[PDB]
């Protein structure tokens, strides 16, 4: 049994998220969770969207808690994708990382393909990743559509917690004031398409482990 | 890497493809100029080079209903003739075929995992032992071309081998995009030169 | 778990051919290889094509080497098929053997069905055969679309190597001069169809083991 | 100290304070320019620097009947907002309070004894691990200021942290002097520059 | 080391100098872009990096009869002022100087020869340990430029240091070509990006 | 080693140079024929060879008062362009340079003296490891010439590398004799042929 596939018509995956895990050592607090991040859809043409890997931006929950603390450090951050359409849908996905907040985004798949977590897959694929979201014991991720921060090669040792707006304002002065506020931005591409009008494909989840560190009341944190 | 030598490894799409009603046979030289665009812009500032490892892999991007196949193989004496048929192509060093929608077990090569399953990776990797020249000069497509144009036998010292990709399969007379071919190399960069000066 | 199938949408198979194997005893040389033989496509209607099981005709490589020797003997020859279209494509395949070079080809499936390796299958099937091509260790070929010479019931003990043209010329004199030059011809049928215009289906491979025997320079062999 | 690096330790009053009827919240950057006057005049002839250790301590100087309290804590992203209340301040890294007349068990830190009793030293010391930059440039108050004035986020690379001192307590609407805050540091002086040239 | 990490070492021309009657002070940012046009073309292909080593050497091109001296020192606060006098410059970090005709005992750093004489060699290597940032991003002059002009403190985020070179000598108030400055580095390249997209 | 294989080591004059006001760039093929007239007369007696070692050194002949500098770097694609600027040339393989009056610390390579100072020495040795071809045949200029003019890529078969030398300096737009270039090689001669028959 080798070199023999069986093309399904649909990949089913049932996500049942696990409760957040929080645990405090003396001054550091460690949080590990996973929330859903974005929903994706394909078009006849390329489409590059992008995301800040900062805690406010990563999760709806995250932001609300992580905000009670002055500066964090990522320990792990994973973007993993999961399909919703049948294996008949046309179009693939691509993601990779970028780091100088002043760099323009790629416009070509060609381009996109040399970034740090370059990963790509037909839009109907992705169910291998499931354990990462569920966080189960992974089977064989050979084929998953995951991307993970290169946590150890970030520029700052720690980063302050920033609110979107504070960020923005800053960035607006000079885009690379930004280069402190965030360690990296994730880049997404949806090409391959069939409809000129968007077809919804999959959705992707974030899974992190962050160090929290110098308590502040939320109201004062920007 | 030494203070003389540079070792570089990387991934990239070397090329994009589609299938038709009928057969179409392409060929791409296994020269850093043509392998991808980055390798090009990088390799470019080195005069000679040597392939430590080089591999082409495919990754499906179409629907499970796209009908068709890919076939890759290698030629090594540029005087030789591109196979006409698939037939001839199934006899080359490294022959491989697969339905245009399969191939994502290969994603680990673009990745770097340890493909447990290489059993269904549509990939192809060069027999670097059997290469004819210890090292190769960095040619530009043009120079190369012009050069050949004189007497193909000259390409024999300009390059290790040529990859032959066949795309037979189809439903439309209209090319349907099926996948993409990515390159994975570990080049041995060798005696600097200023880009501008290279041919 | 019995009497329960799961209809895939596509059968995937990755062929990665093995290097030719040559090994010389004193005067006999033995060659074992596999090359691709033909590509098949279906039509709204029946279509009988046919092939000579002689070495020139069997492979593009074969012919070039086998030609350096005066007469051979088959030890094994297998025709195995592999799908390319989705399990939605209509039309099946049929193959069988014929032996008096003067016999007209069948025109009916009915007809076709009583030949020596009668084998048939929907055009989307075939991935069981894979080991034969790859030559792997076969799993369960119950359902493969293979056909193999009945090597031991051929008419001549050995056959001379013939060039197509020499053959032809001969055949043209009297079709059954032919009866020496080749031990048998394979017959192919593609019916079932849907389009009036040809739809490409699968392709088939040959896998042989031949005895080579009384060296001659190629230039002199016809 | 190396022939490249200089290590310097010292003590100094970083600042003097009083209390009133009501609350008053000050802040002082934990930058050698602002920590004391000597550190200033010394550090000044170095371009970069790094805090090996830094600590603020208080020493009472009023009568056992002066009524009031001191509260110190640390902030680290200059975009953040000085706590309005004490309340907010009791939640910062390093929070500490004590009656304005207590605190002389801390004298050992200005001294260098080995405070057996750190149990009632009104002191506060920086979490140098958790600092964001490996090293810090020597900013002058001005430059710093002007810089911030553009987009506070920039202060984030100009400094490790800001100390927040709250003085609530009182009897007079008239500030009554209660104590003094001294600094104890072990600075890592780093790549000379001529004073005059520094900002 | 070569994974996702690329290391390379090179040596090239950073710039040329000439002397006048008076004193002229220049500065070079020590970033991959501005160090040389080679590195520049190679480094653009990667997102961020860190200097493992870098160093400037000056090589005479004159007769023994020219009149001047080169000087150089590193500076690290994109915000401080350039020296304005030899003396000032005198206490920068690699302070080094000599007559515009001396220096030959420096081929070696260029050359990549092991030569037990640094006896004298107008060479200055960076203190690649005490850089503010773990790593730095690839910044392209024009951007840098732009940013630095918002506030001359942002650059501090973008570059590990700046070389100061003063040409004082003077025979003529005309400019005399005296030699050149060469950079010798070992850089560690890291998050590949399409060249074209790197500001 | 001496069987059917012959090894010999020698040292001679490869060529002489002079400086002008402007920049002049030359090139020398580094083959036995063109390296010197001695080797040339010795090597013709053998069919093919390989460089075990070869290297060019420059020796001053002027007063300390001349004005110019020699430069040199190796190139390996008989098809690429000669540098056109110091900078360009600056990142060739043995980049080395100095004032036309410096260099004496090079007798040694000529001399065959063990001398712990290469301190400075305008010397460039070939990277005799990274040559394209295992061995090379004896080619006689005029032939080489001829061939290279068919396509400037055939030479790549015939020679391991080319020295580039640029004389930039300039006092006068007249030519000034400044010194000479000397080659020091160790060649391995191999399939004896009547001299007269070797093109
Ligand atoms: Ca904040
Ligand atoms: Ca070249
Ligand atoms: Ca015959
Ligand atoms: Ca400063
Ligand atoms: Ca950049
Ligand atoms: Ca010859």
The residue ranges of every structural domain in chain B are: 1-199
E59 to chain F: which residues are within 8 Å by CB? 69, 97-98
B and D touching (3 or more beta-carbon pairs closer than 8 Å): no
Whole-angstrom distance, CA of residue E120 vs CA of residue B180: 57
Question: Any bridge partners for residue B8, and if so which?
Answer: B187
Phi, psi at residue B171, to the nearest 5°? -125, -45
Neighbours of ion ligand 4 (CB under 5 A): D 137-138, 198; E 77, 80
Residue E27 contacts residue E164 (beta carbons within 8 Å): yes
Q: List the single residue in A89, A114, A125 with the smallest CB-CB distance to B104.
A: A125
Buried b (16+ CB within 10 A) or exposed e, A43-61: bbebbbeebbbbbbbbbee
Whole-angstrom distance, CA of residue E123 vs CA of residue E106: 7
Residue B53 contacts residue B183 (beta carbons within 8 Å): no
Whole-angstrom distance, CA of residue B117 vs CA of residue B108: 9
Phi, psi at residue E5, to the nearest 5°? -100, 135
Residue from D44, D48, D139, D149 whose CB has the most chain E CBs within 10 Å, to mutate: D48
The Cα of A97 is separated from the nearest Cα of chain B by a number of Å equal to 14
Within 13 Å and on the Cβ side, how many CA atoms surround C97?
Answer: 18
E187 to chain B: which residues are within 8 Å by CB? none
Phi, psi at residue B110, to the nearest 5°? -85, -25
Residue A11 contacts residue A144 (beta carbons within 8 Å): no
If residue A79 lies in a helix (H) or strand (E), which one and from where to where? strand A71-83
If residue B55 lies in a helix (H) or strand (E), which one and from where to where? strand B51-60
Residue C89: count of CB within 10 angstroms of its CB: 24
D135 to chain A: which residues are within 8 Å by CB? none
E111 to chain F: which residues are within 8 Å by CB? 94-96, 118
Ligand nearest to the CA of C213: 3
- Put simply, the answer to whether E77 touches D198 (Cβ < 8 Å) is yes
Neighbours of ion ligand 2 (CB under 5 A): B 137-138, 198; F 77, 80
Pick the residue from chain B with its C-alpha nearest to F87: B194
Neighbours of ion ligand 3 (CB under 5 A): C 160-161, 221
Ligand nearest to the CA of E45: 5
- Tell which residue, C91, C92, C97, has the closest CA to residue C77: C97
E and F touching (3 or more beta-carbon pairs closer than 8 Å): yes
Within 13 Å and on the Cβ side, how many CA atoms surround E176?
Answer: 28
Residue with tokens 């080094």: E96
| Alpha-carbon E118 to chain mean position | 18
A10 to chain C: which residues are within 8 Å by CB? none
Phi, psi at residue A83, to the nearest 5°? -75, 160
Phi, psi at residue E117, to the nearest 5°? -165, 115
The Cα of A112 is separated from the nearest Cα of chain E by a number of Å equal to 8
SS3 of residue E166 by DSSP? strand
Residue D7 contacts residue D189 (beta carbons within 8 Å): yes
Residue F154 contacts residue F148 (beta carbons within 8 Å): yes
Residue B53 contacts residue B128 (beta carbons within 8 Å): yes
Q: List the single residue in F97, F117, F121 with the smallest CB-CB distance to E59.
A: F97
Give the contacts of B75 (CB within 8 A, at least 6 positions apart). B27, B82, B92, B161, B162, B163, B164
C neighbour chains, 3+ CB pairs within 8 Å: A, B
Helices (H), chain B: 32-35, 37-43, 86-89, 107-111, 141-148, 155-158
Q: DSSP states of E35-73 as a string?
A: H-HHHHHHHTTBSEEEEEE-EEEEEE-S-TT---EEEEE
- Put simply, the answer to whether F131 touches B136 (Cβ < 8 Å) is no
Q: Please tell me the total number of residues recorded for chain A in this structure.
A: 222
Residue B105: count of CB within 10 angstroms of its CB: 23
Q: DSSP states of C120-166 as a string?
A: EEETT--TTTHHHHH-------TT--EEE--GGG-SSSSEE---HHH
Q: Is B58 exposed, middle or buried (0-12, 13-18, 19+ CB in 10 A)?
A: buried
Q: What is the CA(C25)–ligand 3 centre distance, in A?
A: 22
User: Tokens for B102?
Assistant: 């399969």
Residue E175 contacts residue E18 (beta carbons within 8 Å): yes
User: Tokens for A221?
Assistant: 């944190």
Whole-angstrom distance, CA of residue F51 vs CA of residue F53: 5
Q: DSSP states of F30-82 as a string?
A: -SHHHH-HHHHHHHTTBSEEEEEE-EEEEEE-S-TT---EEEEEEE--TTSPP
Q: What is the CA(E92)–ligand 6 centre distance, in A?
A: 61
Question: Domain C1-222 belongs to what topology?
Answer: Jelly Rolls (2.60.120)
Whole-angstrom distance, CA of residue A96 vs CA of residue A105: 11
| Alpha-carbon E185 to chain mean position | 10
The Cα of E88 is separated from the nearest Cα of chain F by a number of Å equal to 31
* First vs last C-alpha separation in chain D: 25
Q: What is the CA(E136)–ligand 5 centre distance, in A?
A: 9
Q: What is the CA(B25)–ligand 2 centre distance, in A?
A: 28
E158 to chain A: which residues are within 8 Å by CB? 176, 179
The Cα of D167 is separated from the nearest Cα of chain A by a number of Å equal to 19
Residue with tokens 């390409």: B155
Residue from B66, B83, B97, B101 whose CB has the most chain C CBs within 10 Å, to mutate: B97
Q: What is the CA(D35)–ligand 6 centre distance, in A?
A: 81
Residue E127 contacts residue B18 (beta carbons within 8 Å): no
Residue F168 contacts residue F86 (beta carbons within 8 Å): yes
| Interface list for chain A against chain C, based on CB atoms closer than 8 Å | 1-9, 87-88
Residue C164 contacts residue C31 (beta carbons within 8 Å): no
SS3 of residue F12 by DSSP? strand
User: Tokens for E100?
Assistant: 């515009």
- Where in chain E does DSSP place strands (E)? 6-19, 24-29, 48-53, 55-60, 69-75, 96-99, 123-125, 136-137, 162-168, 176-189
Residue from E46, E191, E199 whose CB has the most chain A CBs within 10 Å, to mutate: E191
Q: How far is CA C218 from CA B77, C66, D20, in A?
A: 23, 9, 113
Buried b (16+ CB within 10 A) or exposed e, A104-143: eebebbbbbbbbbbbbbbbbbbbbbbbebbbbeeeeebbb
Residue B5 contacts residue B189 (beta carbons within 8 Å): yes
* First vs last C-alpha separation in chain F: 27
Q: How far is CA F28 from CA B74, F56, F68, F138, F184, in A?
A: 38, 11, 20, 16, 15
If residue D89 lies in a helix (H) or strand (E), which one and from where to where? helix D86-89
Give the contacts of E142 (CB within 8 A, at least 6 positions apart). E199
Whole-angstrom distance, CA of residue D17 vs CA of residue D122: 14
Q: What is the CA(A48)–ligand 5 centre distance, in A?
A: 18
A222 to chain D: which residues are within 8 Å by CB? 77, 79-81
Give the contacts of A16 (CB within 8 A, at least 6 positions apart). A134
Cα E10-E14-E17 angle, rounded to 5 deg: 150
| Interface list for chain A against chain B, based on CB atoms closer than 8 Å | 2-5, 7-9, 87-92, 109-110, 113-114, 118-122, 124-125, 140-143, 192
F97 to chain E: which residues are within 8 Å by CB? 59, 61, 107, 110
CATH number given to E1-199: 2.60.120.20
In angstroms, this model's resolution equals 2.8
């Amino acid at each position: 049994q080798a070199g023999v596939s069986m093309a399904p018509i649909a990949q089913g995956t049932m996500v049942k998220l696990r409760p957040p895990m929080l645990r405090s050592s003396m001054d550091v607090t460690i949080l590990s969770h996973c929330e859903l991040s974005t929903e994706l859809a394909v078009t006849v043409t390329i489409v590059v969207t992008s995301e800040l890997v900062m805690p406010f931006t990563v999760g709806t929950w995250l932001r609300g808690v992580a905000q009670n603390w002055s500066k964090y450090a990522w320990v792990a951050i994973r973007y993993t994708y999961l399909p919703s359409c049948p294996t008949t849908t046309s179009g693939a996905i691509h993601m990779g990382f970028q780091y100088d907040m002043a760099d323009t985004l790629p416009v070509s798949v060609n381009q996109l393909s040399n970034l740090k977590g370059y990963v790509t897959g037909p839009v109907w694929e992705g169910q291998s990743g499931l354990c990462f979201v569920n966080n189960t014991k992974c089977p064989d991720t050979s084929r998953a559509i995951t991307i993970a921060l290169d946590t150890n090669e970030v520029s700052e040792k720690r980063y302050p917690f920033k609110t979107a707006t504070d960020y923005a304002t800053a960035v607006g002065v000079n885009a690379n004031i930004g280069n402190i506020l965030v360690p990296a931005r994730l880049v997404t591409a949806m090409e391959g398409g069939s409809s000129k009008t968007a077809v919804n494909t999959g959705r992707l989840y974030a899974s992190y482990t962050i160090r929290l560190i110098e308590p502040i009341a939320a109201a004062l944190n920007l």
